[PDB]
Amino acid sequence: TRFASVYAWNRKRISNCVADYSVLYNSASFSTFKCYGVSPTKLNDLCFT
Amino acid sequence: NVYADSFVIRGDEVRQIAPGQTGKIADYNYKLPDDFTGCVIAWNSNNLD
Hints:
little secondary structure; Spike protein S1 (chain B); part of a larger assembly; 0% helix; 2 chains; extended
């Protein structure tokens, strides 16, 4: 619905779920995407903490 | 051994034409090798399509 302001941002914790990002192909269209310390093609075989 | 390929895609999906990328265009439609040798060219054609 609504987002926050730059000078006072937000933080949320995620846990105990399975990450399948193929569900975003239908609607979302992103103009920027960059990852540091990992490779985009290796994101389907790892587990995150 | 020169060759040329041609097709039409959306606006913000031109960042996926490069080795080592993920998305709906680099997964099901068109993929590039890892040891590539060539050039990539694109331009805007809003007035003709």
